């Protein structure tokens, strides 16, 4: 989850 | 925070630099700071964010990369030319 | 023998009499030992004689550095060494890689040749560090992107186009 | 010799072409070449320079 909205 | 955590526990180098990457192209500061972990580290998608960057490349960037050191552009030059070198060889 | 100083093989040495014996043993035991004594005369002699010792040396460092020593030798017959690098091309690659890091005329020349002869391109342009720029540019007429990049920051007129192309 | 040299420097001085000329007359003396007399005439191209140094 941290780390799909760090790539969105 | 999670890339600085990955930072203090070589592939999880890598993933952090190219999370790095990806939020300095999301974003002049911030790309500086990047420039120098990458010259402080010192393969084709790294070679590609190292591109994009370079694609992308005042008075607070120039005291923060001052208080680094403690001329950018030309050592950033030379970092993106060590890595296609590095890149070469691989 | 060397502390001093098959049947045809043996009088043919001694109608020429070190060389030539230890070119002898290496061929009938053709290891270890043959390999050894071929390479201390090779190095206790250092053009049909040389080539021959040369090929054989490389040869045999491959099968258990060599090249570049090999080449800077020659270098100071270059179809015969063309050949050999033919032969030679990984392992190859990285020991010229090497001799390029160390040392940050017909040897490149021959190099350009053969590389000439992805991969490609990235060996042309290791080996010449314009003929990178050259070489991606001939192949370009993601890997469009990848090419542009690349030439930008090795550059760094041809930007500026490169920049327009790719916005284009 | 070396004053035609003087002279093709000025040239390119006064961008494309005369960095072409430059080149060309490299070769040239690398043809010629192929000792003070060829360091007074010596005195991608960067890196060419460095590989004959």
Same mark, same amino acid.
């Given at each position: 989850?941290?780390?799909?909205?760090?790539?969105? | 925070?999670?890339?600085?955590?990955?930072?203090?526990?070589?592939?999880?180098?890598?993933?952090?630099?190219?999370?790095?990457?990806?939020?300095?192209?999301?974003?002049?500061?911030?790309?500086?700071?990047?420039?120098?972990?990458?010259?402080?580290?010192?393969?084709?998608?790294?070679?590609?964010?190292?591109?994009?960057?370079?694609?992308?490349?005042?008075?607070?960037?120039?005291?923060?990369?001052?208080?680094?050191?403690?001329?950018?552009?030309?050592?950033?030059?030379?970092?993106?030319?060590?890595?296609?070198?590095?890149?070469?060889?691989? | 023998?060397?502390?001093?100083?098959?049947?045809?093989?043996?009088?043919?040495?001694?109608?020429?009499?070190?060389?030539?014996?230890?070119?002898?043993?290496?061929?009938?035991?053709?290891?270890?030992?043959?390999?050894?004594?071929?390479?201390?005369?090779?190095?206790?002699?250092?053009?049909?004689?040389?080539?021959?010792?040369?090929?054989?040396?490389?040869?045999?460092?491959?099968?258990?550095?060599?090249?570049?020593?090999?080449?800077?030798?020659?270098?100071?017959?270059?179809?015969?060494?063309?050949?050999?690098?033919?032969?030679?091309?990984?392992?190859?690659?990285?020991?010229?890689?090497?001799?390029?890091?160390?040392?940050?005329?017909? !040897?490149?020349?021959?190099?350009?040749?053969?590389?000439?002869?992805?991969?490609?391109?990235?060996?042309?342009?290791?080996?010449?560090?314009?003929?990178?720029? !050259?070489?991606?540019?001939?192949?370009?007429?993601?890997?469009?992107?990848?090419?542009?990049?690349?030439?930008?920051?090795?550059?760094?007129?041809?930007?500026?186009?490169?920049?327009?192309?790719?916005?284009? | 010799?070396?004053?035609?040299?003087?002279?093709?420097?000025?040239?390119?001085?006064?961008?494309?072409?005369?960095?072409?000329?430059?080149?060309?007359?490299?070769?040239?003396?690398?043809?010629?070449?192929?000792?003070?007399?060829?360091?007074?005439?010596?005195?991608?191209?960067?890196?060419?320079?460095?590989?004959?140094?």
């Amino acid at each position: 989850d941290w780390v799909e909205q760090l790539i969105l | 925070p999670y890339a600085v955590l990955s930072q203090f526990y070589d592939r999880e180098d890598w993933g952090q630099a190219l999370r790095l990457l990806l939020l300095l192209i999301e974003f002049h500061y911030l790309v500086l700071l990047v420039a120098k972990f990458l010259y402080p580290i010192f393969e084709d998608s790294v070679a590609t964010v190292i591109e994009v960057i370079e694609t992308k490349w005042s008075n607070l960037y120039e005291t923060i990369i001052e208080a680094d050191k403690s001329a950018t552009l030309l050592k950033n030059l030379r970092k993106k030319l060590n890595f296609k070198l590095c890149q070469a060889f691989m | 023998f060397q502390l001093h100083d098959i049947w045809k093989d043996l009088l043919c040495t001694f109608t020429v009499p070190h060389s030539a014996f230890y070119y002898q043993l290496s061929l009938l035991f053709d290891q270890e030992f043959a390999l050894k004594c071929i390479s201390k005369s090779a190095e206790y002699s250092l053009q049909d004689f040389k080539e021959k010792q040369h090929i054989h040396y490389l040869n045999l460092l491959i099968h258990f550095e060599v090249l570049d020593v090999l080449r800077l030798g020659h270098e100071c017959r270059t179809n015969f060494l063309q050949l050999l690098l033919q032969e030679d091309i990984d392992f190859f690659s990285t020991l010229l890689r090497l001799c390029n890091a160390h040392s940050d005329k017909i !040897v490149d020349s021959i190099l350009s040749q053969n590389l000439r002869s992805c991969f490609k391109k990235l060996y042309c342009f290791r080996m010449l560090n314009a003929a990178a720029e !050259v070489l991606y540019q001939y192949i370009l007429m993601i890997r469009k992107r990848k090419c542009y990049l690349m030439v930008i920051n090795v550059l760094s007129v041809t930007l500026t186009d490169l920049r327009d192309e790719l916005r284009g | 010799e070396t004053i035609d040299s003087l002279i093709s420097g000025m040239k390119i001085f006064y961008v494309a072409a005369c960095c072409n000329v430059m080149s060309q007359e490299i070769v040239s003396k690398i043809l010629e070449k192929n000792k003070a007399k060829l360091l007074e005439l010596p005195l991608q191209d960067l890196m060419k320079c460095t590989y004959k140094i």
